[PDB]
Nucleic acid binder design. Structure first.
Lengths: 81, 18, 98, 94, 108, 138, 98, 83, 94, 108
DNA sequence: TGCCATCGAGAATCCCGGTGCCGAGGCCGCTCAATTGGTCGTAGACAGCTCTAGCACCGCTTAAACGCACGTACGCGCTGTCCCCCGCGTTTTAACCGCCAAGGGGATTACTCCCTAGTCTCCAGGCACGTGTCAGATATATACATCCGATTCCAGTGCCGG
DNA sequence: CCGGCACTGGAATCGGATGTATATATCTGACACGTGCCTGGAGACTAGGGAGTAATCCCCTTGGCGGTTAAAACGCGGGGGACAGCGCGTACGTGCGTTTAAGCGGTGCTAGAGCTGTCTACGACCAATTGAGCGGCCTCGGCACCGGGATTCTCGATGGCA
């Protein structure tokens, strides 16, 4: 798998900005958004894979994601726990 | 799990406004 | 030919997307991105579908909150257009950056 | 093949008390389950710390009351303390 | 033997006192647990659940609905000051956001 | 320790930034003790025949503001003199702005106002400044 | 007839106070303020000296951090003077105010 | 004895020194009242928690550990006072 | 009436890194606070890890995983190296 | 009965393994504690202490002093990225701040 | 000469009747977790004492806080220009959905055997007390580094004649 | 149509005032060491169960494949907003003289924190029952579409009156 960050298209980022109340968007915003999302996902996925490896499993479960997010102060409801 | 030498110390970058 | 002025359709989309609850990123590209990021930490990994669903919900919530903060920072500087400087200021004050 | 536990039946009973003609879906019920578990862990952890600070081995209702006062905002804390006091008095008298 | 009566009925509650007692005893919180701590905890949890459910049911009624969905819970939580304080760092799946447009953006 | 009644339900207060404000008209009157430059047929005739740059310099002299090319002729024609008297801080501040104008621009302003283009800088200044207090039909 | 221009002494003061570590508030007024605030929660309260010391240390750290955030918000808007609106923006983005 | 109007004991020169340690060059005249309000809210929260800790232990004296626990509970860990 | 702290061990470590350097009492108090804070962080993470996987014992595996969860990258790598070396030496020359 | 040797000397450590074990057993973390957990934890604590002390001693030497004070610890922590991340929400009493003035405020 | 109110055109956005379905809400049987009843040992509540430290009053000096005046530079409004982002129509592109198939691995029992908790000794590492001396804080005396007002000094206007 | 010839404005070049770092001399109180002792960690056992390992079974995750069809990509005008420049006016910074209360050293006085001893009620633990909740299954109505009007809402084109 390579160059999958381009799958986050400009219309999708525009919809996410519209849900946030933004009316006008500069042209240099999309690359910045992609970088911010990449950093966030790297942190969460690293913690979730650590949780998976401690249990000697090969599959990442939703509980691992919930524990990682709770570790980062981002508690999420509606996915068990 | 054991490694060699010291660690790579890094600098903290501070936001500056043009 | 009928035409709307710049800003009418944008306000219509703001009202439309602030009323629904569905996800705004397509599922297949997001899944590919998650697997690509995870390949670095461990090889031959598998995922439940609920794990990727949880990741997507968390990611969209995070981005929407950041866009709200960025819009506040842009209005503070007497603008209506958002720029990368606004994102940088918001992330600096939130503490996600020294 | 082993049984799982949740708070669905008690949440449904409370809802039938407050809104006798209202239902709930599965996703909202999962969210309510998460909420109950979250608040339980928060209060139990604060009571554990309170007992450790004062060098005690048991957790009593005094620790629960102090933890509730430390965690909840004002009016919520007052009415929760009133509810807990009423329940304990009714339990003890009976 | 006299016939049983659960502690929940003794305390006039709907939440289970015995299960809360077992969770406290097996949660690594202390060496010992008093008799009245589960009753207090169950009463507080029931009070908070009822507080959220009342507002959620009102929100569902305002939208001409019979069943509560995650959106109604989100509206109820985010429109209440103290509930918003208690659940400030919590994400509710499929909840959405509160409608809010800044005044400088609306057309002149 | 037991409360009575329900619980007071306060509302969330959200931070909003000042939308600021806008006014349609900048000056309420700005009318002086003299005749409008549009009613003085001869000044209206010279004002109709002069280039945009003389009109820009005259609008900068009258109203201290750069004038939009369409408004510029209307804004100069509706001038009825200054509301201040000889010796006021405003009179001194206009006299200096006249002393700071190039001799060719003073001669162009005299030709807009039907004033004589002859004489010393200080006299062109005095003759324009007396005319801008009381615009008289010549 | 010797005078410094505005900003010179301000920069000297910044360099002087960013090098020292001492407390910048008088102790007796702060102690009076603490006792008055506390007298609402409970009457006839005693305090250790270290308790008031800890409170003052924490308060000064909190205020200095808030002032740095306020300065960033003011420079974002092309100013050098800080205003109450900068404080409100910083506190809203920090999450201390809805 | 009852105390009153001590918030004015936080003087304008003290607020200026605190802003100078934060790297601020110019201050408008309306900042001092806003700073006083912010400090009052912060202190009210911390002191409420600390007095709750004191009352649980059945004491009449607030200790430094009470303040340390209150600050840690609010997410502001302080080093150098016994914890 | 006897109160324990980490002062002598911190002094030994300092005399190892900087043979001709001293420390003040306030700085040593800050060091004691740091040691206690990091101890509680790691112990709490390991306790939650043991609870998640339905275990009764806390072993060096839980400590290693908690260290990887709480420390930034290079710090975590070198801490894992030191801990593994210490455990090997302890189990090596019993 | 042979002559006693501490577990710290066996692990090649300076921090007390027995005290760390005792604190683990009385903190309500789990029901049982393994033999190698206190050794691992004491080694990690020693490593972190040595890192901070090594930076603070350099700061004290750069200020031409032979003793470490809280200011030196603050400078060491806030100038190092990993330590700054680890102790991001911590206040050091009498530590001060890092000298930093924005470029726009400086004279032309 | 426009202006303005003109629309009304056309596009979006509610409001209500009809159909279908799958997800929420009742039943049913069972088993395991909560309940009842009875012992037992210790955790905590209460009752004295002992000092420590927290509070309160009192002069005194002196540095800091407080008004007051002035002037400069910064905040804020207004104008103009251009280029970048929005709205729209057309052509690609791939997400989504409805099946089929195969194997990996998670999830549950059964055995066993090391590994940790729990007792006695017992002895040596660490804490409390006491003391000397040297690192750092303070005090001057002096030289160096900026700040800003001034004076001088290149070239380029207004006066007045020409 | 000059044209000197004063006049002026700027520029770069001082040069005093002041702030600040640097080089010695004292001096004191906090740190580093030494000593005694006591209690907490080490050493040597025993006993029981927590977890590691070995199978075993079935779910669920990963590929693979067509086929609509809506979303995405790409030009293309054009208008509105971002940004730069300029001017004004007032509100903060700097400095000075007068007031005030903070900090310090000192002295009492007593409240309450901390420790110790003594009982006793209450929580852990064990054994025998039993009904509350969970997994499984069925059923019908709340909600999702789907369509026909219907009511407003932008945006510009027009008409009438002065």
């Amino acid at each position: 798998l390579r160059d999958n960050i381009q799958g986050i298209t400009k219309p999708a980022i525009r919809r996410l900005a519209r849900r946030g109340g933004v009316k006008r968007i500069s042209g240099l915003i999309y690359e910045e958004t992609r970088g911010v999302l990449k950093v966030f996902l790297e942190n969460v996925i690293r913690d979730a894979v650590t949780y998976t490896e401690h249990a000697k499993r090969k599959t990442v479960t939703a509980m691992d994601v919930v524990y990682a997010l709770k570790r980062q102060g981002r508690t999420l409801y509606g996915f068990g726990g | 799990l054991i490694v060699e030498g010291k660690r790579e110390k890094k600098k903290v970058e501070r936001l500056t406004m043009q | 030919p009928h035409r709307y002025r710049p800003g009418t359709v944008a306000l219509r989309e703001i009202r439309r997307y602030q009323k629904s609850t569905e996800l705004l990123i397509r599922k297949l590209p997001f899944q590919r991105l998650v697997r690509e990021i995870a390949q670095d930490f461990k090889t031959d990994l598998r995922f439940q579908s609920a794990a990727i669903g949880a990741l997507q919900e968390a990611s969209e919530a995070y981005l929407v909150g950041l866009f709200e903060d960025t819009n506040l920072c842009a209005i503070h500087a007497k603008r209506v257009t958002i720029m990368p400087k606004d994102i940088q200021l918001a992330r600096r004050i939130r503490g996600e950056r020294a | 093949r082993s049984r799982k536990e949740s708070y669905s039946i008690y949440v449904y009973k409370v809802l039938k008390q407050v809104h006798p003609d209202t239902g709930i879906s599965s996703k909202a019920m999962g969210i309510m389950n998460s909420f109950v578990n979250d608040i339980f862990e928060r209060i139990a952890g604060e009571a554990s710390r309170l007992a450790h600070y004062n060098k005690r081995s048991t957790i009593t209702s005094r620790e629960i009351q102090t933890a509730v006062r430390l965690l909840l905002p004002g009016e919520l804390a007052k009415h929760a303390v009133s509810e807990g006091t009423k329940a304990v008095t009714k339990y003890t008298s009976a | 033997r006299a016939k049983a009566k659960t502690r929940s009925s003794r305390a006039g509650l709907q939440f289970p006192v015995g299960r809360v007692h077992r969770l406290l005893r097996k949660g690594n919180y202390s060496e010992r647990v008093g008799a009245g701590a589960p009753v207090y905890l169950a009463a507080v949890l029931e009070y908070l659940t009822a507080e959220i459910l009342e507002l959620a049911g009102n929100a569902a009624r305002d939208n001409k609905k019979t069943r509560i969905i995650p959106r109604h819970l989100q509206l109820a939580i985010r429109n209440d000051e103290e509930l918003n304080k208690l659940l400030g760092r919590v994400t509710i799946a499929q909840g959405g956001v509160l409608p809010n447009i800044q005044a400088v953006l609306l057309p002149k | 320790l037991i409360v009575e009644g329900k619980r007071e339900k306060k509302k969330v207060e959200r931070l909003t930034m000042q939308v600021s404000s806008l006014q349609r008209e900048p000056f309420t009157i700005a009318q002086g003790k003299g005749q409008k430059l549009c009613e003085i047929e001869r000044i209206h005739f010279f004002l109709s025949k002069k280039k945009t740059d003389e009109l820009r310099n005259l609008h900068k002299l009258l109203y201290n503001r750069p004038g939009t090319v369409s408004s510029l002729k209307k804004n100069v024609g509706q001038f009825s003199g200054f509301p201040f008297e000889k010796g006021s801080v405003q009179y001194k501040k206009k006299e200096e702005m006249l002393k700071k104008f190039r001799n060719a621009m003073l001669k162009s302003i005299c030709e807009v106002l039907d004033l004589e283009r002859s004489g010393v800088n200080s006299e062109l200044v005095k003759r324009i400044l007396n005319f801008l207090m009381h615009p008289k039909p010549s």
